[PDB]
Design an enzyme around this catalytic site. Sequence first.
Site, PDB file in Angstrom:
ATOM      1  N   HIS A 188      52.423  42.145  42.203  1.00 26.09           N
ATOM      2  CA  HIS A 188      51.297  43.086  42.139  1.00 26.09           C
ATOM      3  C   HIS A 188      49.969  42.494  42.638  1.00 26.09           C
ATOM      4  O   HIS A 188      48.990  43.221  42.823  1.00 26.09           O
ATOM      5  CB  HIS A 188      51.133  43.623  40.718  1.00 26.09           C
ATOM      6  CG  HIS A 188      52.283  44.464  40.250  1.00 26.09           C
ATOM      7  ND1 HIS A 188      52.185  45.318  39.174  1.00 26.09           N
ATOM      8  CD2 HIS A 188      53.553  44.584  40.713  1.00 26.09           C
ATOM      9  CE1 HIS A 188      53.348  45.918  38.984  1.00 26.09           C
ATOM     10  NE2 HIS A 188      54.193  45.491  39.904  1.00 26.09           N
ATOM     11  N   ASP A 197      55.332  40.994  38.626  1.00 24.70           N
ATOM     12  CA  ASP A 197      53.982  41.502  38.378  1.00 24.70           C
ATOM     13  C   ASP A 197      52.989  40.557  39.068  1.00 24.70           C
ATOM     14  O   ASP A 197      53.339  39.960  40.074  1.00 24.70           O
ATOM     15  CB  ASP A 197      53.733  41.638  36.864  1.00 24.70           C
ATOM     16  CG  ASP A 197      52.721  42.727  36.529  1.00 24.70           C
ATOM     17  OD1 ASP A 197      51.521  42.534  36.815  1.00 24.70           O
ATOM     18  OD2 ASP A 197      53.124  43.774  35.971  1.00 24.70           O
TER      19      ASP A 197
END
Lengths: 444, 446, 444, 444
Positions: free
Chosen positions: A292, A256
């Site tokens: 991300h 992430d």
Amino acid sequence: ELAKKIEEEILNHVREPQIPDREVNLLDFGARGDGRTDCSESFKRAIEELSKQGGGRLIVPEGVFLTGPIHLKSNIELHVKGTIKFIPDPERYLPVVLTRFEGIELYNYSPLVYALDCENVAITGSGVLDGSADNEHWWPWKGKKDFGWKEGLPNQQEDVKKLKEMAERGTPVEERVFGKGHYLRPSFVQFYRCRNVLVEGVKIINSPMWCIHPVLSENVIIRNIEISSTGPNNDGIDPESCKYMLIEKCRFDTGDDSVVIKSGRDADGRRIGVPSEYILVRDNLVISQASHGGLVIGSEMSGGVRNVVARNNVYMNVERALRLKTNSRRGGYMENIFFIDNVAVNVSEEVIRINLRYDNEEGEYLPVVRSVFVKNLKATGGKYAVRIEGLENDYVKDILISDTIIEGAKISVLLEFGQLGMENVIMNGSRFEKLYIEGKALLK
Amino acid sequence: MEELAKKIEEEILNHVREPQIPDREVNLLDFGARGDGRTDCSESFKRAIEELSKQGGGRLIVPEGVFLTGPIHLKSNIELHVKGTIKFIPDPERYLPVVLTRFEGIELYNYSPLVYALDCENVAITGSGVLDGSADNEHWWPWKGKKDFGWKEGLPNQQEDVKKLKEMAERGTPVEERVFGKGHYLRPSFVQFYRCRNVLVEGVKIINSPMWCIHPVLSENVIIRNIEISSTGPNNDGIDPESCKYMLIEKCRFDTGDDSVVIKSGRDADGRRIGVPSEYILVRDNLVISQASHGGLVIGSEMSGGVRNVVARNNVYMNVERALRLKTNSRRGGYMENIFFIDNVAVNVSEEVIRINLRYDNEEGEYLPVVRSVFVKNLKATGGKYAVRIEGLENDYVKDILISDTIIEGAKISVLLEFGQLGMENVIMNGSRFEKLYIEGKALLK
Amino acid sequence: ELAKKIEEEILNHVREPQIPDREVNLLDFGARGDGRTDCSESFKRAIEELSKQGGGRLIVPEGVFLTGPIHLKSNIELHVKGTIKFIPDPERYLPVVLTRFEGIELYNYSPLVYALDCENVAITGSGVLDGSADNEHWWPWKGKKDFGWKEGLPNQQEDVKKLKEMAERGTPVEERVFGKGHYLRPSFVQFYRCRNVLVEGVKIINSPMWCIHPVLSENVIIRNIEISSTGPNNDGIDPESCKYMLIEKCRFDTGDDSVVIKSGRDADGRRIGVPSEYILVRDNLVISQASHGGLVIGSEMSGGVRNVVARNNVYMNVERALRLKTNSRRGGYMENIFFIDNVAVNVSEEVIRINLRYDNEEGEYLPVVRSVFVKNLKATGGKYAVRIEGLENDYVKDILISDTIIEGAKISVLLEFGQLGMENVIMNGSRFEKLYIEGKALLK
Amino acid sequence: ELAKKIEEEILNHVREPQIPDREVNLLDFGARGDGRTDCSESFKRAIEELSKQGGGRLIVPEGVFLTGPIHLKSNIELHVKGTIKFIPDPERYLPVVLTRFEGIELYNYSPLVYALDCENVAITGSGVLDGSADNEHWWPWKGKKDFGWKEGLPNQQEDVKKLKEMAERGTPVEERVFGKGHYLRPSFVQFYRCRNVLVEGVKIINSPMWCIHPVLSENVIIRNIEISSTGPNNDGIDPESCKYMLIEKCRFDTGDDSVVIKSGRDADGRRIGVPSEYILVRDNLVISQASHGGLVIGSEMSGGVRNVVARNNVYMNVERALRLKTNSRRGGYMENIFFIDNVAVNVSEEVIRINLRYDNEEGEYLPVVRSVFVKNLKATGGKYAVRIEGLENDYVKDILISDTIIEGAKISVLLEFGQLGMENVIMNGSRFEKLYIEGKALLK
């Protein structure tokens, strides 16, 4: 100019923790590095002995040492040469402790390395911290089949809904008890309301969720570590309501956001009202298709985030280089964010993203998002070079991009309800000596 | 793809045709005229036109020579065929009594235009000769009030009369009571057709104009073709179609002191009262080579009656201040819309290639103009302080402006946008290629 | 500043002719302007009466005057107010006179206005010269169906072939007699070996072939004329082996090259060996879809062409702005050609063209083509911006384009066996601060 | 899809070596990781014990292990967890072995890790290989003052000249004896005529000269290594006359060419006549100011180099991204070189360099250099974007650059005696749909 001033300010307050000149070896406490013996009690005994004498250095030698959660105390350095491998049995992380899940305070499973209200705490060495998370441990709780969830098995969804509700209604933290019978994963390494913290040298793998999560902490140094964990919500470092923090010379591969600056979520975040501020992120390397975002602010930024300098970092293969996310449930602010002398290559989604519609959630607390500065960025790739989206009654303000080159992005600029300045910027077959826009724009 | 600009050009061409002129001719030299540039031929023109009009119309031949005359009044079914020079005597007294006319968008009674037709049908000016208005720094031009154009300190100018005329229009003072002329300083138009049908102007060169050169007003079916305007004095507009419908301007050459081709429809209250737009105007295959020109294709500022459905195609503009110019303000009301600027070339533009301004003369009022649907396609342009300068109002954005398949090079500023909505598709601007450039709000691009 | 230096030099040696202060009116020699009366003898007598006295002005008043060819003499000004309309009967243009057909000397039909070995000659006025050429007069001789040639009817082809062979063989000019029974059209206005020539004011229409054709002449001014004739080989002005010439303030609509500089063809051209040189072409307007070229050099350049300045001209709708034509049959040279401060808009073929294989002809006389300078050109349109082809054994050399903007041409550069330099040039999305190429190139 | 076809072909023939399921620890053979104890015999004894049984893994645990050269045997894996630090005494690298110096075969000092005629050999682990070269050891032999050479002291220059002459006059390899009394540095890691070779995980520092040098080898995988050595001729990886090789996921900081594909020099290279071919170089990172080139071919390419695919690499701060070098002494060829989906940022010299005048030395063996393909390159910086220089009698042929953007280079194209095609390219904000040039060009 502000960026140098902020860096200078950070460097004046960031200091290595004092650790008493006293050391102890884990083997002397009955521990075995055979990847078999439960060393939980060894850690407990060694730490307690050190802190009775005033603190010191615990040496974890070469080998694989199985343990439940490690609870640190003030004046303790955990020096890791071999591997600390955590036992992925939720019962071992009980009783519940004061912790945080996605920006909301609660009582839940202990983080795997936990320190509460401590001073002068260090994790050092060039060994490994292995969380033992996989498709059969911790990760199924997310509820994603990608990571071992199946129909008929529990996941976090109902607990996340209850937690947000409890915080909405402003219930006391002590009343928010999860742990057993609930499915909220713990953080890996968490310092909760600590001062003078050092994390260095170590490699972190197989993390249950967020890897390094200092909360409400001051004078934090994270240097020369490696994060290599690409499961669901495997954020790299989450400074949350922290002040005076240095992140340097780190290597990231995350599931992430890589470096993500936070300060609590919605009502709970506004209740605590403590911003993350004076954070320096420099000389780091992200090589991560799964990441991300290289440098990320939010979405849990309800306590505010300001005075952040990210300088001389390299981002490779990431989804986003710089990402700011928030919505009208959050309130708070993100301002004075400097993203300077960075390189971001083979970006897949957006090089620069500012989003005020995170999760498509709405409410009555309009976030202040302003004063974001990008200078001397060299970047490559993306569906968007620049994607900035505010709200009709809450423009993104004072965004400046200068001395920057972004090559191979499909869309140069998507702007909605914002003000954007560009000075000496090159984007594919377009060059801007001076561009200023307020309102809405699409450039490709 | 099916283009609206083509359909509008079709529609214009379907309602445009040359006037029928009776097969009959008389020569000006048969009426006491002399081309010696000395004899007053005023009565020669008048008797020749009446002799023709008596029979039902025809051609008046003006042969080689220079013919001095006061204003010429045409009648229906008359073609003025100019081979020599018609040189107008610049004594204002000669242009009285006052006639129904217009000054900068407001109707009044004033000095006769030099060539004048009122309520006429089938009227033409043809031939390869010259119309010479005799304006210079000693004649007509000093009335403007500018020193470089002959005005001297302590001498009269138009300013008080312009002020008075505007106030009268505001009141609602009937036109018959707006009497100027003698003792007043409002210059007349050069060639004016007032409320006429089926008008042709071709071939002639026009020089030394008092003010606006060709001024059709409230007229329908007008052709101006293969003429040359060469007059660089104050307010020397080339062609001013004012509240006209179905007009073609083609194959003309321009060197003008102000706007070259300027579409208008009255100013403020007077423009709203009459309420007739200029519409279905085709401007094609023209050439402007003019350092002095304030604009190649211009709309406004007197557009209070509305301007719509104008196509300017395949024109060439050289050295001009602006290629395309729309001017209005919040005193004007009305609209400018469906303006098509297609296949044009502009070289060495000095000010702005494309200009849209809703703050003309920095004057404000209660009548917000509608400015929308302006289309620039296949423009090739060179030079300028600005390529695109578009300025609307906070309560009145410029809307639906589209520039496509267009290259503009060597402009200092690419875009100045304030209170507007701008779209660009497949454009090159000072080296920057944009597949798509859409901006709504404010912008400065350099 | 070589272009300025050349222009200065030309202006130093170009002067209007002295014409005696004496006048005569054509009407006083039996002429009528009724477009019916044959005025041939009138012109003859008027010119004789003037010439007898040492020269003067012949007034052609308003009206239409039918005539065969006009033969001018030294110290004569033909002042044309009306229309002189030439009777298109080839018999009227005999006996043959010394003249030229496409670069080769011969005896042939008289030009419509002809002067041989004359000094101080002028054509002035605001009138019209009407050659009466159309689809049934003169033009069929070309052999093109478009211009009235019919199957089985004669044309120029065989005579052209025979003329070429005569010249190749070194057949004396005085043995090259065509005229009657042959299909070579005359020039319209021709000054042959003349000095101090002025053509001004007049309009030229319906030309049999080349419109204004000064040959081996010196101190020639063509000023303020209009050419409007779009038939086959309706060249505008053809300076052929001329020295010190000014063409200015003229308007062109032509069926072939507009202004085209020549100096004889092949062996005939080399025999004579007189270049066209010191020609100034300025302040002209070409509005002409039919025009094959705004300024052209060749293909009859076998005597050489050098020191030509074309400045501040406007070209609209033309096939080419600047064109150089030659082949290896020609020999000779084209050099020091200056094309400065011009504007060429809506160009249909090539803005700039140079080609060394004209008419698919070859020989053993390689032409020297070098030192062509394009500066401060603004141009639009074209299949090519720049198209330059030499020979493998004869490159086009030292071509320089500078301070130039060409928009909307499909191909920017086609170069084949040549040397091209560009400095400060813009072509659509390509910008050249400094380009140099030698060899072959395609830029698009 | 020739690049795709080549990558697939390489991946069909590349695979990890089989290593017997057997292991031994270096400590069991008298070694001490104290950074003082000579472990030379420990390695020798431990390899021999494994070899005699049929092979296996040699574990080098935590610590610093001093040693002379390590000589591997078939079926041996050297698994490095600690540091192997080589003792920089040249006498320890005797007796002389079969090796190469700059493309020419000789008997010289042993490489630090050496395998001759071996099968199934691996170097693994996350430890360090330290060559101990610095301004006082090995490096002074280059003859540069910047790397420790003193005036009056010996250098490699004479021995280099001597070796050239031996190879040219054809003297047998066994009669080319250097070592003691001579000044030619060995390679670091060298596999000579080996098969099924793996190098992974390890960090290489302080190299005498070329770091990883497989020669005449087939099926070689180099992955997840770091080179960090910036001395003279500190090349990263030198595949020399190798076939079927994969270089992936590596990190470079080198003092010379980072990845360089070779196949012998001059007469010696032609004598052997084995090309380097089917080499795949992908997903690598170079962050190196000192690097002379990211992917390089030559100059020792006399045996030929063909079918090389370099894909999805990132080059930062390097002198050159792609470099081909040779001269008319070399002969041989370089063809079918593919440079696809690469990113180069802050290039200092030339982004793309092709030079047939290496060292300005000439001879009678014109090199074939053709068919070099660059697609989807994004690059920033440079004195030249593209610099291509052939010879009058030997053009660089069939170079195609497509879908490529290069910004911030001073000169766009320098071309001499070459054939360059470009399709869909952007250079310093100039867009070319097509740019084809044959001959000479200079574009700024």
